[PDB]
Amino acid sequence: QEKQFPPALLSFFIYNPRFGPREGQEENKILFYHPNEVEKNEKIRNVGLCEAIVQFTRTFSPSKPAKSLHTQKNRQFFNEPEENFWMVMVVRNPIIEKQSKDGKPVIEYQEEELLDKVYSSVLRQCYSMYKLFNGTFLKAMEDGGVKLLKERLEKFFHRYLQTLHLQSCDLLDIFGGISFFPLDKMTYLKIQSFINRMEESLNIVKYTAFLYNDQLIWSGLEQDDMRILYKYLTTSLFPRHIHYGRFLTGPCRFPKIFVNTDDTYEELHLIVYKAMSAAVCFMIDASVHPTLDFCRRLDSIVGPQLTVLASDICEQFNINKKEPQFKFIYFNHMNLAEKSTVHMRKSLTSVHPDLMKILGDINSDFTRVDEDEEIIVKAMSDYWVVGKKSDRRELYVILNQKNANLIEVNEEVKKLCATQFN
Amino acid sequence: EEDATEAWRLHQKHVFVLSEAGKPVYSRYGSEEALSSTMGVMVALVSFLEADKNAIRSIHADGYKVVFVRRSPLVLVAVARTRQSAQELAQELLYIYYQILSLLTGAQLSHIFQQKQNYDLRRLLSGSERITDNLLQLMARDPSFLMGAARCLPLAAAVRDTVSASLQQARARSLVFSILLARNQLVALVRRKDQFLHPIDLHLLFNLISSSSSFREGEAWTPVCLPKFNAAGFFHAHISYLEPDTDLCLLLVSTDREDFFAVSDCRRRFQERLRKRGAHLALREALRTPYYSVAQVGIPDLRHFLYKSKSSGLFTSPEIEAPYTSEEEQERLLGLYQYLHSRAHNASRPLKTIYYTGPNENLLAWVTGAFELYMCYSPLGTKASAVSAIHKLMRWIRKEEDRLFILTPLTY
Amino acid sequence: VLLKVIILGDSGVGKTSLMNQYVNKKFSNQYKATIGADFLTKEVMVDDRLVTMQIWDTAGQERFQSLGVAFYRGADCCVLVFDVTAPNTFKTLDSWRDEFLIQASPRDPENFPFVVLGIKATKRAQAWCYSKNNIPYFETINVEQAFQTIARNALKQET
Numbered sequence A: 001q002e003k004q005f006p007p008a009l010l011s012f013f014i015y016n017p018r019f020g021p022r023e024g025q026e027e028n029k030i031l032f033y034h035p036n037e038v039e040k041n042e043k044i045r046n047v048g049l050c051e052a053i054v055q056f057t058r059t060f061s062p063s064k065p066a067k068s069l070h071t072q073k074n075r076q077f078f079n080e081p082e083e084n085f086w087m088v089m090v091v092r093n094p095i096i097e098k099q100s101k102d103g104k105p106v107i108e109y110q111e112e113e114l115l116d117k118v119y120s121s122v123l124r125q126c127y128s129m130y131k132l133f134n135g136t137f138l139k140a141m142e143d144g145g146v147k148l149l150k151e152r153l154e155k156f157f158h159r160y161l162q163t164l165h166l167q168s169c170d171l172l173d174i175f176g177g178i179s180f181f182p183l184d185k186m187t188y189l190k191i192q193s194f195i196n197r198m199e200e201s202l203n204i205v206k207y208t209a210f211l212y213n214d215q216l217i218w219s220g221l222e223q224d225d226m227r228i229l230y231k232y233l234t235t236s237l238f239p240r241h242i243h244y245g246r247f248l249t250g251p252c253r254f255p256k257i258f259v260n261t262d263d264t265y266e267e268l269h270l271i272v273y274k275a276m277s278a279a280v281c282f283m284i285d286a287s288v289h290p291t292l293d294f295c296r297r298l299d300s301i302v303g304p305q306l307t308v309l310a311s312d313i314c315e316q317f318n319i320n321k322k323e324p325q326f327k328f329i330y331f332n333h334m335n336l337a338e339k340s341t342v343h344m345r346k347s348l349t350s351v352h353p354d355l356m357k358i359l360g361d362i363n364s365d366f367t368r369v370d371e372d373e374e375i376i377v378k379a380m381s382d383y384w385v386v387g388k389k390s391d392r393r394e395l396y397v398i399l400n401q402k403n404a405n406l407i408e409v410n411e412e413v414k415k416l417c418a419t420q421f422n
Numbered sequence B: 001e002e003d004a005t006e007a008w009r010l011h012q013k014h015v016f017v018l019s020e021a022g023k024p025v026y027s028r029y030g031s032e033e034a035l036s037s038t039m040g041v042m043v044a045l046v047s048f049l050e051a052d053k054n055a056i057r058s059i060h061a062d063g064y065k066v067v068f069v070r071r072s073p074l075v076l077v078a079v080a081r082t083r084q085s086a087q088e089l090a091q092e093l094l095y096i097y098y099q100i101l102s103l104l105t106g107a108q109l110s111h112i113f114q115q116k117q118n119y120d121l122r123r124l125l126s127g128s129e130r131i132t133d134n135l136l137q138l139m140a141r142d143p144s145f146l147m148g149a150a151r152c153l154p155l156a157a158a159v160r161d162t163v164s165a166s167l168q169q170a171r172a173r174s175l176v177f178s179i180l181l182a183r184n185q186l187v188a189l190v191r192r193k194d195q196f197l198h199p200i201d202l203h204l205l206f207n208l209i210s211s212s213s214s215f216r217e218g219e220a221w222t223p224v225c226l227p228k229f230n231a232a233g234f235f236h237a238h239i240s241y242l243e244p245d246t247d248l249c250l251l252l253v254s255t256d257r258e259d260f261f262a263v264s265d266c267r268r269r270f271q272e273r274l275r276k277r278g279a280h281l282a283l284r285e286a287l288r289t290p291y292y293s294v295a296q297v298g299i300p301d302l303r304h305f306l307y308k309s310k311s312s313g314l315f316t317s318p319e320i321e322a323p324y325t326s327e328e329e330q331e332r333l334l335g336l337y338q339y340l341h342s343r344a345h346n347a348s349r350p351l352k353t354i355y356y357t358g359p360n361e362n363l364l365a366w367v368t369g370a371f372e373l374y375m376c377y378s379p380l381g382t383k384a385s386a387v388s389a390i391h392k393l394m395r396w397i398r399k400e401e402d403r404l405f406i407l408t409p410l411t412y
Numbered sequence C: 001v002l003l004k005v006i007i008l009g010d011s012g013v014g015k016t017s018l019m020n021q022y023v024n025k026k027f028s029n030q031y032k033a034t035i036g037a038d039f040l041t042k043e044v045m046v047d048d049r050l051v052t053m054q055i056w057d058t059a060g061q062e063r064f065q066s067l068g069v070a071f072y073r074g075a076d077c078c079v080l081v082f083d084v085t086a087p088n089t090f091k092t093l094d095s096w097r098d099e100f101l102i103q104a105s106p107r108d109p110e111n112f113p114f115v116v117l118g119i120k121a122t123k124r125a126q127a128w129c130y131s132k133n134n135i136p137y138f139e140t141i142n143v144e145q146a147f148q149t150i151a152r153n154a155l156k157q158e159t
Helices: A040-057 A116-134 A137-163 A171-175 A185-201 A223-237 A292-320 A354-366 A406-419 B002-009 B033-050 B086-104 B106-115 B129-141 B143-147 B157-169 B199-209 B261-277 B279-288 B327-344 B383-404 C062-071 C089-104 C122-131 C143-152
Strands: A003-005 A009-015 A030-034 A066-071 A074-082 A085-092 A095-100 A103-109 A205-212 A215-219 A246-249 A256-259 A266-275 A278-285 A327-332 A337-340 A373-379 A384-390 A393-399 B013-019 B024-027 B056-061 B064-071 B074-080 B175-182 B186-191 B220-224 B235-241 B248-254 B302-309 B314-316 B351-357 B362-367 B371-377 C002-008 C037-046 C049-058 C077-083 C114-119 C137-139
Touching (some): A009 A137, A030 A040, A040 A066, A040 A074, A066 A116, A074 A116, A074 A137, A116 A137, A116 A171, A116 A223, A116 A256, A171 A337, A171 A354, A185 A215, A185 A278, A205 A223, A215 A223, A223 A256, A266 A292, A354 A373, A354 A393, A373 A406, A384 A406, B013 B033, B013 B086, B033 B064, B033 B074, B033 C049, B033 C062, B056 B086, B074 B086, B086 B199, B129 B143, B129 B199, B143 B199, B143 B327, B157 B186, B157 B261, B175 B261, B199 B235, B199 B248, B248 B261, B261 B279, B302 B383, B327 B351, B327 B362, B327 B371, B362 B383, C002 C089, C002 C143, C049 C062, C062 C089, C077 C089, C114 C143
Parallel strands (some): C002 C049, C002 C077
Antiparallel strands (some): A003 A095, A009 A030, A009 A085, A066 A074, A066 B056, A095 A103, A205 A215, A246 A266, A327 A337, B013 B024, B056 B064, B064 B074, B175 B248, B235 B248, B302 B371
């Protein structure tokens, strides 16, 4: 009876080597450190190890510092979201607890299971998740010093790291795309007309977004900001709550988000309204503070109109609705479009978990080339796994055709590409 | 200095060998004494995690990888800007470690570095750097190291058995192996009863013979250790070239240092046996064309292949032709083969068929329990053409099998 | 000829003073606040032989104590920098050497080469050095003389 221990978040810390230049103030480098109950000397030792790793890799490539450090027991992922500000995530290696001849628990560390891209993307997502709600590190610094920066870091990451689950992280976490909601042109035009009507009648509403069935439909924001906003809406905001029009966020306190950080650095109150699953997000300038009567005014104006629209999508979606032997993950980089027939709502994998490592390694080998590419593989578990990278689209197909040759696999892949991607 | 440092940083694979105390032992590019501080940093990084009940494996950065392997009393570091994974780079570093062992014996290495850890291993390894550079170049271009298998020189079955019998007839008590070599290719191997030859020792012997020209001046008698066979003892290899104009290298491994006249006999005896039977003309003819073209197979859109037999531990491959005429293209093709082999031979995720369709080439890998076959096609080749190539090449290898492989390995 | 030299003391991190004004200023590799050691290179010309010093200027913080057994292995000699403005001179000079001999554990700790560099009474340190098997004492210029004597010793033992 072997025991399997999945990867776990060993530690997470944000530091700045420029702080505390003189001896005895190394503790000032560590802006945030989790777990907090770890001893101070151990904290300084871990931060110093990461600084040493980056400074050593800078002797072979000054422009490109280290992104990862692999050890026997854990893997540590580095990121520098802002100059001199380093985040580090230490993730425990998977463990096999073998029963030896006289029991003798043997703790084997499976050092090759973890996919580096998954946790690197997770770390980048941690930074962007912080920056969506609290802005950049430098802005908080110029506002209120290292003290204010540390309070903001703690207040966000103490509650953010509780919701991080590194056992369920997979290729979809590398992708970081948006699961879009397919639609026809008439309903798209209706959505645009509705969004214009409400954002013009309400005046102060300066940004908008429309999602249905947890899937994004239309986005008035910027791509790299709407990405993180959609992650917040789907994986954090909706699950806590999972005419019929109802306020989902607000009453009057509205979360303050920061978008277009690289260009304009706009702070907006975030408002979310639900009719069925037709989520509408309004974003209002920070100068205007909404009142109880404004949302009451807002409720009346949106009200049945979203409810009328909501009852319209469900009928058309049901009307549009043999078994597809293909199970694929598709990612488009132009629009960050993401589709998946493998992962369902548990979201964790619905296939044999030994094939996700294959799917992650095909992705690992893909990015070394910026051209058309194709890798077709057959596992020892008689499963066919294909991957195609063409004109900034990535397709990963898995098929159960144990009695099939290469020609039949290619024919099935071509049929899928012609049908599901017409 | 600024330009020299910038050129030093741009090398595709730095290899550092250092003691557990930090003192340099070897650097592929640049002097060891100018890199002493960086090797001290390497030891400090190793020890920092060793004192944390951990062990540092590798550091991955965009575009390159640092790989640490600790084979006490040595730390071997590889800073590679290539595609090779950490496992393949660790395998190359282990090949370097076994190359050092082949010169020093593990017993002597551990003893000298446990009596004192302030010792400078460069003192014992002085003059043996060029062996390490030659071994690294062979990894860069020879498919044998990636395959972990020997290549057989294509030779007629009658001639191959004649030369094998001639090798067997010339034997001594102390001999363990009898190897006939042609440009890092096997011609005839005669081994002792129940004394297998690991591929790693054979590759180390390839590198040893191909690193120096002193073996071409006559008879050689040097102590060499076979780390995968017996890491605590020294063998003694008699290395000779049969004729001055040929590339035939005869290696006779023995357990006795004093026995040199006997091994020189067993060399002369085999030479005159070969001359008496008249097979030396056929061997010279085979040496004049020591490779075969892809066009012999007859399937178009094929450029190169590797075929290893799991049962025999031997592989065959045609001559590397256009477009891989240059060294860069040969290295790229070998790197593609390395990628295919590593992916298909994952410890936890093994695979049995890989088909890669890149803009520059098509790559195929078929790995079963009996053989592994790696194929290269032009990018214009289709999938059905690839399968037909599989079947035609299988038929052709099963037809030329006697000529391309040693099918009946002899024994004293 | 490459030597591994450990400098005990010098809480300077970046401004090590002695290990910044010694020689070269290239091959810096400053990790005395992250690893606990400074890795420097210094060529020394002694008796028709040119030796190289892989100097390990180790940090003296308390979070780097567990790294002594590792960082001190293979060391050929150790250099002590001793403050002349301390009240515990005789009780803290011996502690450094005792802990070094415990952690490094050379083959002949009794005859291990040591050198004391007075930084910033001389009688006390000189008497301690004489009572410690005649350890050379230099007052710190004078950072060059110690390393040549450091080169002079530890070559006599092995070579």
